[PDB]
Amino acid sequence: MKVLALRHSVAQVYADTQIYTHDDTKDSYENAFLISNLTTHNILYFNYSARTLEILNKSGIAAIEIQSLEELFTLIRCNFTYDYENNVVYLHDYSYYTNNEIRTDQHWITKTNIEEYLLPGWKLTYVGYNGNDTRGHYNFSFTCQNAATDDDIIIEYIYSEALDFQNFMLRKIKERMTTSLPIARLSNRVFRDKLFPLLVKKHKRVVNVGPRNESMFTFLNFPSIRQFSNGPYLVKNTIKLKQERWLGKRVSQFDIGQYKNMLNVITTIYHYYNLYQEKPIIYMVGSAPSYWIYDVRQYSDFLFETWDPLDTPYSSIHHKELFFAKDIGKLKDNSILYIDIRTDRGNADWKEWRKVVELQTISNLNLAYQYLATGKSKVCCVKLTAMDLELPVSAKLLHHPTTEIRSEFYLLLDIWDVNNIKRFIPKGALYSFINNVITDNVFIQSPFKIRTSVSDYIVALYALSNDFNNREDIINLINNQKQSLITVRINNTFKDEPKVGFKSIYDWTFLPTDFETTNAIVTSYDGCLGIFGLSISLASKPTGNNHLFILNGTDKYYKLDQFANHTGISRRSHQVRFSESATSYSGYIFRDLSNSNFNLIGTNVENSVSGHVYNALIYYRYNYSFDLKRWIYLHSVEKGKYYEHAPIELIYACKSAKEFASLQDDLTVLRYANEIENYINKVYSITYADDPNYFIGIKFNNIPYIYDVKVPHLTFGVLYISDNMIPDVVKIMKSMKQELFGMDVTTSYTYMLSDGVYVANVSGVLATYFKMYNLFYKNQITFGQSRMFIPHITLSFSNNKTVRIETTKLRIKSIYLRKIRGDTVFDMPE
Amino acid sequence: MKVLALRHSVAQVYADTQIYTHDDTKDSYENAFLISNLTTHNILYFNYSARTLEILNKSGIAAIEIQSLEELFTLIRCNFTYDYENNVVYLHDYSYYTNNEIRTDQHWITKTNIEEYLLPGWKLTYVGYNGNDTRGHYNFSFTCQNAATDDDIIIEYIYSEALDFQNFMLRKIKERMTTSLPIARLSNRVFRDKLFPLLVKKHKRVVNVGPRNESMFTFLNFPSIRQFSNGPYLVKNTIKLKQERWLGKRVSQFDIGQYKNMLNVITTIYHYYNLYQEKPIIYMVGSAPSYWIYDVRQYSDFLFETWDPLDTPYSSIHHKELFFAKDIGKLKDNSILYIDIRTDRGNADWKEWRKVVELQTISNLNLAYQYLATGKSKVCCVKLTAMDLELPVSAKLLHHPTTEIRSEFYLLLDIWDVNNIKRFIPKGALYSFINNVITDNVFIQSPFKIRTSVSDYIVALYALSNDFNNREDIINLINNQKQSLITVRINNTFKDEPKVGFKSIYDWTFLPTDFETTNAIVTSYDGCLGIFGLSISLASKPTGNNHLFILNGTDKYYKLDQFANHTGISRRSHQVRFSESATSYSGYIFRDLSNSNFNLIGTNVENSVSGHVYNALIYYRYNYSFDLKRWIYLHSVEKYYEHAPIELIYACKSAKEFASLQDDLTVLRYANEIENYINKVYSITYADDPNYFIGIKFNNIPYIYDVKVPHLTFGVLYISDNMIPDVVKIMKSMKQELFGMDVTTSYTYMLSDGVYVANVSGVLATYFKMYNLFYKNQITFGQSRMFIPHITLSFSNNKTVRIETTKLRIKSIYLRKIRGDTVFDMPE
Amino acid sequence: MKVLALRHSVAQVYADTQIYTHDDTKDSYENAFLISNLTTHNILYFNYSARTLEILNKSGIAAIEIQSLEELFTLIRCNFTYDYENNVVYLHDYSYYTNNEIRTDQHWITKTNIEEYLLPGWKLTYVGYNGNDTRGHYNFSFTCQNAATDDDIIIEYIYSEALDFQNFMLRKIKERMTTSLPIARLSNRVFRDKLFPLLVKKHKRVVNVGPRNESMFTFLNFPSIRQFSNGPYLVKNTIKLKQERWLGKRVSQFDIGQYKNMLNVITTIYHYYNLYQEK
Ligand SMILES: Nc1nc2c(ncn2[C@@H]2O[C@H](COP(=O)(O)O)[C@@H](O)[C@H]2O)c(=O)[nH]1
Numbered sequence A: 001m002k003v004l005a006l007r008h009s010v011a012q013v014y015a016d017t018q019i020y021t022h023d024d025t026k027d028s029y030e031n032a033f034l035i036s037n038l039t040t041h042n043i044l045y046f047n048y049s050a051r052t053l054e055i056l057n058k059s060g061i062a063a064i065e066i067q068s069l070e071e072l073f074t075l076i077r078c079n080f081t082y083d084y085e086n087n088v089v090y091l092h093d094y095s096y097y098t099n100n101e102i103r104t105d106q107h108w109i110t111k112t113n114i115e116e117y118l119l120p121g122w123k124l125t126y127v128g129y130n131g132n133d134t135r136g137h138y139n140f141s142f143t144c145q146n147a148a149t150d151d152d153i154i155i156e157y158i159y160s161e162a163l164d165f166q167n168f169m170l171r172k173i174k175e176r177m178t179t180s181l182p183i184a185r186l187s188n189r190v191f192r193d194k195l196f197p198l199l200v201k202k203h204k205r206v207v208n209v210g211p212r213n214e215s216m217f218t219f220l221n222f223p224s225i226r227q228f229s230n231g232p233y234l235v236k237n238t239i240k241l242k243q244e245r246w247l248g249k250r251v252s253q254f255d256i257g258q259y260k261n262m263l264n265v266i267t268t269i270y271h272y273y274n275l276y277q278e279k280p281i282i283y284m285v286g287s288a289p290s291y292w293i294y295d296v297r298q299y300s301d302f303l304f305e306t307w308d309p310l311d312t313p314y315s316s317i318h319h320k321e322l323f324f325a326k327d328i329g330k331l332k333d334n335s336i337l338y339i340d341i342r343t344d345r346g347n348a349d350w351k352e353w354r355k356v357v358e359l360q361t362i363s364n365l366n367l368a369y370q371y372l373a374t375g376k377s378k379v380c381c382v383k384l385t386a387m388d389l390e391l392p393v394s395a396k397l398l399h400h401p402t403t404e405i406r407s408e409f410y411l412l413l414d415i416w417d418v419n420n421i422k423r424f425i426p427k428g429a430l431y432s433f434i435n436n437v438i439t440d441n442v443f444i445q446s447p448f449k450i451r452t453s454v455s456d457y458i459v460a461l462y463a464l465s466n467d468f469n470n471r472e473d474i475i476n477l478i479n480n481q482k483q484s485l486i487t488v489r490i491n492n493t494f495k496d497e498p499k500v501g502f503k504s505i506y507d508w509t510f511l512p513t514d515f516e517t518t519n520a521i522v523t524s525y526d527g528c529l530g531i532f533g534l535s536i537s538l539a540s541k542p543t544g545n546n547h548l549f550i551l552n553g554t555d556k557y558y559k560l561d562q563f564a565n566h567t568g569i570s571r572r573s574h575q576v577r578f579s580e581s582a583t584s585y586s587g588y589i590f591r592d593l594s595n596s597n598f599n600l601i602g603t604n605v606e607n608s609v610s611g612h613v614y615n616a617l618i619y620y621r622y623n624y625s626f627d628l629k630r631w632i633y634l635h636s637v638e639k640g641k642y643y644e645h646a647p648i649e650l651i652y653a654c655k656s657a658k659e660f661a662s663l664q665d666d667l668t669v670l671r672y673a674n675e676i677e678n679y680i681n682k683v684y685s686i687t688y689a690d691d692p693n694y695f696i697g698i699k700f701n702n703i704p705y706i707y708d709v710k711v712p713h714l715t716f717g718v719l720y721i722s723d724n725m726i727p728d729v730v731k732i733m734k735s736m737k738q739e740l741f742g743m744d745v746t747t748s749y750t751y752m753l754s755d756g757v758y759v760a761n762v763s764g765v766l767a768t769y770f771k772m773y774n775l776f777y778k779n780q781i782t783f784g785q786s787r788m789f790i791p792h793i794t795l796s797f798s799n800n801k802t803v804r805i806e807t808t809k810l811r812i813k814s815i816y817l818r819k820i821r822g823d824t825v826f827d828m829p830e
Numbered sequence B: 001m002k003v004l005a006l007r008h009s010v011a012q013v014y015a016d017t018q019i020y021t022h023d024d025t026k027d028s029y030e031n032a033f034l035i036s037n038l039t040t041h042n043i044l045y046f047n048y049s050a051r052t053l054e055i056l057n058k059s060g061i062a063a064i065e066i067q068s069l070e071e072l073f074t075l076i077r078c079n080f081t082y083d084y085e086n087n088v089v090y091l092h093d094y095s096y097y098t099n100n101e102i103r104t105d106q107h108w109i110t111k112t113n114i115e116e117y118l119l120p121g122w123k124l125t126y127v128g129y130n131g132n133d134t135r136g137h138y139n140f141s142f143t144c145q146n147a148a149t150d151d152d153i154i155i156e157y158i159y160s161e162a163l164d165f166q167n168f169m170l171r172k173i174k175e176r177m178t179t180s181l182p183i184a185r186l187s188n189r190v191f192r193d194k195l196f197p198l199l200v201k202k203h204k205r206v207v208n209v210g211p212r213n214e215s216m217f218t219f220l221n222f223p224s225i226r227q228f229s230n231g232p233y234l235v236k237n238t239i240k241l242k243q244e245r246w247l248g249k250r251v252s253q254f255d256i257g258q259y260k261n262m263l264n265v266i267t268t269i270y271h272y273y274n275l276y277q278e279k280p281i282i283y284m285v286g287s288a289p290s291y292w293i294y295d296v297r298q299y300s301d302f303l304f305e306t307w308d309p310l311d312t313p314y315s316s317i318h319h320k321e322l323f324f325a326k327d328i329g330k331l332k333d334n335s336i337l338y339i340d341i342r343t344d345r346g347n348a349d350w351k352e353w354r355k356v357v358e359l360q361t362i363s364n365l366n367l368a369y370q371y372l373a374t375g376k377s378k379v380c381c382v383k384l385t386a387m388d389l390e391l392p393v394s395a396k397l398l399h400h401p402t403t404e405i406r407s408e409f410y411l412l413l414d415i416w417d418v419n420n421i422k423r424f425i426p427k428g429a430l431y432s433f434i435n436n437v438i439t440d441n442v443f444i445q446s447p448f449k450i451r452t453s454v455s456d457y458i459v460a461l462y463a464l465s466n467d468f469n470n471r472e473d474i475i476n477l478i479n480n481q482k483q484s485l486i487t488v489r490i491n492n493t494f495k496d497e498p499k500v501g502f503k504s505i506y507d508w509t510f511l512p513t514d515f516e517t518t519n520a521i522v523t524s525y526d527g528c529l530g531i532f533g534l535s536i537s538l539a540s541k542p543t544g545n546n547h548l549f550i551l552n553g554t555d556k557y558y559k560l561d562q563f564a565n566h567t568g569i570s571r572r573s574h575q576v577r578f579s580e581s582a583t584s585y586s587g588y589i590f591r592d593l594s595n596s597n598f599n600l601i602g603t604n605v606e607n608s609v610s611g612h613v614y615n616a617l618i619y620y621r622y623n624y625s626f627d628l629k630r631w632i633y634l635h636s637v638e639k640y641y642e643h644a645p646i647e648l649i650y651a652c653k654s655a656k657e658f659a660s661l662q663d664d665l666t667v668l669r670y671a672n673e674i675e676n677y678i679n680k681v682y683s684i685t686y687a688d689d690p691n692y693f694i695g696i697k698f699n700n701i702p703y704i705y706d707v708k709v710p711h712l713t714f715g716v717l718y719i720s721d722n723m724i725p726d727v728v729k730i731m732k733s734m735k736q737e738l739f740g741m742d743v744t745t746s747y748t749y750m751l752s753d754g755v756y757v758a759n760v761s762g763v764l765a766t767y768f769k770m771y772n773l774f775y776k777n778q779i780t781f782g783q784s785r786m787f788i789p790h791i792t793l794s795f796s797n798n799k800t801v802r803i804e805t806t807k808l809r810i811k812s813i814y815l816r817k818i819r820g821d822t823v824f825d826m827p828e
Numbered sequence C: 001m002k003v004l005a006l007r008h009s010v011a012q013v014y015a016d017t018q019i020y021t022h023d024d025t026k027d028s029y030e031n032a033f034l035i036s037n038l039t040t041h042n043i044l045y046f047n048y049s050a051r052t053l054e055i056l057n058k059s060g061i062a063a064i065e066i067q068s069l070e071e072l073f074t075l076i077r078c079n080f081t082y083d084y085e086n087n088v089v090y091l092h093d094y095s096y097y098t099n100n101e102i103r104t105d106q107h108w109i110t111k112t113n114i115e116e117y118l119l120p121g122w123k124l125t126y127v128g129y130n131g132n133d134t135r136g137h138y139n140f141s142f143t144c145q146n147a148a149t150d151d152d153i154i155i156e157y158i159y160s161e162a163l164d165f166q167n168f169m170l171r172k173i174k175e176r177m178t179t180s181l182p183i184a185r186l187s188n189r190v191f192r193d194k195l196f197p198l199l200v201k202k203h204k205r206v207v208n209v210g211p212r213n214e215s216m217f218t219f220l221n222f223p224s225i226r227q228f229s230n231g232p233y234l235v236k237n238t239i240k241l242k243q244e245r246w247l248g249k250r251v252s253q254f255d256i257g258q259y260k261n262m263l264n265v266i267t268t269i270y271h272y273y274n275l276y277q278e279k
């Protein structure tokens, strides 16, 4: 929501688009609330309270100080992710195209002949992970960098098997200008990099479910984490494959053999991590260029040993420029070995070269076998070619994207693999694997069993909510797990559809009430981002791939007003109320008509009994960052910290939301409202004195209207009690005697309350009524009725016309407790 | 958008919701444009020029003076329609429900026992037509009134055969709070009343197509207007009806017999108007309550002479308080007669009572016959009951909604009807008509045949666009009419579907290019509202039931910048470019990549080709008030921007690419259609095979150059030798201007593989002015591709270098034979 | 799937529409299988194995012997439900409209002035529950009756609050000719009436979940069954209701006070059944 606070003295004015202006010196939390309810994208903050900036940032709303209006202000007309703890700004902005450049996260790409295939004059410039090397471009009051890169395009080109790069880059850039900004993808890079270190330091055992190739670099420094992904391609599974012949498909114009090498070595690193939770020694044979080491070293320090006749720049120690044949004993006991040996494309016939390469393949495989036969705790990966050969059945198969699909694959072998059953594999099956399979993911770990773990911190970022996963197992995991961070699809669909999908790929959808979590925060990406110290320029759109984030066993659950608060609950409510609606009063109007309070709708903008629940039910697709359930619960057990609202006040908003949904045919909001009302009636064991025996009544000295009944009284309470509780009731009355006479009782008009009932309004007594309802309910005394409480002084049982007077205070003369249908009053304090 | 202008004295500011602020005195017409491109609903204007406030109001955008911050400002946080000519404000706001009241614009309703069936304690409060009686409530710098009424509910209740009013009103009120404000419905009530008087005065002959019961009162004062509706129910058509018996269905809890009487009389008035184009005398018999006269008299004066026993209507000149039996000679020759004979009942038998009513009906029918036997100009309406009887074949049958369906109907009779064939009609058929039909419309006039009329001002207000009307007949009417105001549904669908519909009721959809109008304004409801002196606080939502408005042959067509202007062209463009976009430069970047200007993206924030058209094509669902067609045409034949035609074509190609990427089929069509219109209006030629060229030479070149002769190729042309002199003339015509331009260069870049050039700035505007001069003089200038001003430096495929802004020498300008050593001119 | 087996000697031939022909003497279960895989609606069975008819009937496929080709065969060009244990044929067929008549399951309706509000000349004729009194119309090799009635229309008119019966009946009849036959609704009446007696006799304790008003008559003789439906309207729940005044809405042209009385008494019977499992 991009709130920018600039100095009041330097309150510069320009007509920027979608801007707003706010400033006030009354409270520090309500300035944040009122800012959170502004309707535009950018907000300009002029009294610039540091406290209020911190509150916004905790809520996920980006709030930063602006000191160099000349450049700081103008260079923030784009979205960004703000690390407010370290005061860092990560710009997600593709204006750098005006420099005729493509930006990448990876250094190795700069060494390929990629620039030739770009548009004429274009270059690609390395920017570092999340634009770390761009900090020179921006020298502001804060550290500033541009996290936007074109790496998605390059990776898509590599996996797309289409050849011509010029048109591909051009098409993808034009598309990027035609579609809205990929905020989720770009800010999640920052969130991953900040999140997982905090978890590894802060928690004993961290389990990450379904990592994707995007974060392959994130976990390079954290072997403590146990990863669960899709299964690996085993050799035994090649029995199903139909035999095929050589097929020379070219996928990339520029040589990407280094990307293949890097994905291979990283896959091996993570296999080793999965087996032994420690960082291994890396041994590499071949891999002469080896530039990508740099990109790995940016995330974790590793010890690299290289054997290649050419030079390898970034290696730790290039043990020998000479080739490696029988030097097995140099290899230490806790390590991984990458064997990429290609002798040479000789200038001989292709058949002769094939025999040469086949013999070389057998040599490499035997080298791997000797590597793993001698020593415990090691893993290896070999380059083989497609031929008839006998591989172990449990070995893992790798074919990552390479420049051309030309009869090569890789075999990943642990020590359990070497002495295992070996099977004969024809060249046709291996060719079928090379041609029909491209390895999608470097995480080859066994799938995650969706069971609650008591010693683990489970992290399911975008993996659990899928069409094929068991829904009830997901619900039980979220419900009963301690210490977790799990994400599901939101079900922002009308008609309450239980799945949502794109081109026959579907996801399960959940409402916040579909869970029964005891102690957890159920918020948006904004809320979860704030809980971990980040804020963002751009909120979730109501219709999109929006996810609920659920944090189980968090430090922050009891900080109700601090994290996943009601910031922005009324942003959409206010936009609709002031632009499109029939009247700005429509809300109070509808809420009173929904609770059968139509008897008078006269100036109901004052002292309405409905609550936050109405906007959390109706506009949930916008403000689901609120966590309505925790808000209700924490106010059940004070341990009402700011509000002290009676439960009937919550139930009334529930009923109003149900009627609204039925009018709009919003089936989802109808369910959500019914379920929240159920949760309320579970947390509060509410009772209704629909058949009362006694009542509390207030009597006034003067009555500014013509009255036709003998006794004008305000029925201020109605209750159902046994006689023995009359002292208890009395005590509770005494408990607020001061407060009872303190209230500023006012009346301004008379109206018809029902057929044959003519009453005078009473104002200013309702807050006291709710405090007293809370006290009676806490004391297990049945107080209140099924209907809504309407404070009124009955004037006559006749049908008379409405009369108005100026606000005339009313004065209390006695506050009595009387038995219904008994002329006997059982208490009369003055 | 509510534009609210506050004075320096009232420069007070609060945090109003969805608010914005603008103010400036360094620009003239651009203050209105820049206001028109702001994103929120309400805007506050602080250092305001009266001129730009007027420009906004002419464009349809409501712009009001605000002086009473205490009440006037707080009470304009709701939408309204503003008559800026008379400076009056019609509020459309239903906050008045907080008074426990139902508001009607009709006085007769107040006399019924309707208040009894409302919610307890609620009242019904008569308000003036379009809230005339609310002006007392508001004491502002301007006239102010609240046009919102609950008549939607009352009318729907009467026509919906729902029984219980209390629940119906309650449900409809809740619905009204749950759905957005019916602005089209409410403000068109104002628009009709301002429109049609202006048309009657300003034009001789006015034809109104398909009026509905909503505007029943509007045309009461204009028999000059000839209206065409769906048609009448004739007695001749009762042969189809299957015989039925009495079925006593109750329609309303409170007596609405006065609505029936009024609708009958009004139907008769409009029939009389249809036959003889002049206002009649009104004679009525029975009609004891007589209030609806008031509601009629508020729009037009009529002469009301009623005969009613011992009862006194409202304003009827009571020719006799005695019962009327054989006084036919008292009734004048230019008149209308309504025969509602009370027919009072009693406590007698229902069968005997039926015979009583039958005899009374026969008396009434003979009464009508005696009325019509004489006279040159008369029309009559009679109350009958269901019985066997012989009615004229050409007579019209009326059954307007009444309290109960109790064996009663009304017959409309012409002077032509009496002298026509009479046919026997059984009681069963009459019961079938009473039970199965309620007359929907008081205009029973024959339908409009969709043919152009040359002497008439035709008005088709939401009537022509429909599934069943001939689409090509509509296109020809709009295209070839001389003086009309016609509305059609706009094709705001993403897939190019030519129809749009709900529950088997469909409408044809058109694009602005689907027409070929000669001199006409094709704009939105806002634009049309502005042309007639009204403005509105909030524009139409892009995917609503939005209508194109076409005004043929108006005085305002040539006033381009005043009406149907470019206000709001970039409102959505600016919201998208900031906010959600990948980059704030995204627009210029995409137009340069789509027109093959990808060689460099450096010099594109400055000196880009057209984008005025770009946002009018792709964001058309928002700014369809622009009328891009007249804008293109008027700039072909001057009658400011001085924009080259290729400049428009490039934006067309960019919009086509954008639509193809978004799969916006309608925008793709619209873009291709506009490019077609451009190449139609401009007979463009391209010198793709160059013959000669214009070259500029400078002494200073801040970069290392590896070519022998550095020059800026400022032109390419295909010409005959005989035309070489004329070209020189044009060069001389702006020689000063050519050396005058402040040409600047800032960096070097790659223009293609193996080409290394330096950017050029400040020459492009001169290039377009000169292109216009070449095209006007029928000399082929320019190329199919886009013009890129550059000085070739080398064919060396070298890396790009940047320097500070360096001016250029312009030592010489010249025209040289391409591939020839011959230069044919070289001015100092 | 309407398999009709007729005598091989009397193998009459006509070009009926959607018919088929099968006959074989190799196996008794595979003749049933091969018949079950034929594609048309009606099948004509010529070697007419009694065993194979029983197998089909056990599978749900109607399989009946045809002996009076002249009328039995032609009066089976309509769908039906076949009680193959008792050899009874319940026709679900609305051809009886050609007799200018409306058929009802309930005797009380005949005492109301309903016939006046029909189309001219039309009558309503009581036919008994699932057409028990229609067995006189059909005297075939099997017991035969027409279970089709217009009672759905009358009940819908009573609950629809629209007044004019003539147009309502006409509209609903025209609709019935324009839409396919409501087989599920009509055969489920027969299935309920056969099913629940078998269950009460065959099982100790029978629980029926969510009975609807349609089968209000089915359980009149079985108080052993415990029924579970939607909750009742309690007096205490009137506290929520908004106060209103007299509103005289007329829902039916002919007096249906007897339907009200019957529904009241039957509701009371079932409440008593729910409390005390006896009549
Ligand atoms: N009863 C009640 N009303 C609230 C509460 N919070 C906000 N509101 C009402 O909601 C309004 C803003 O939300 P809106 O009605 O515009 O959606 C405020 O002006 C206030 O009257 C609450 O906790 N309880």
Ligand SMILES: Nc1nc2c(ncn2[C@@H]2O[C@H](COP(=O)(O)O)[C@@H](O)[C@H]2O)c(=O)[nH]1
Binding pocket: B569, B570, B573, B574, B577, B587, B588, B608, B609, B610, B611, B612, B613, B615
């Ligand atoms: N209206 C208009 N805008 C132009 C024209 N040429 C360039 N522009 C640019 O287009 C912007 C309008 O918003 P856009 O959708 O291009 O972002 C203006 O701010 C301006 O910088 C033109 O001829 N007409």
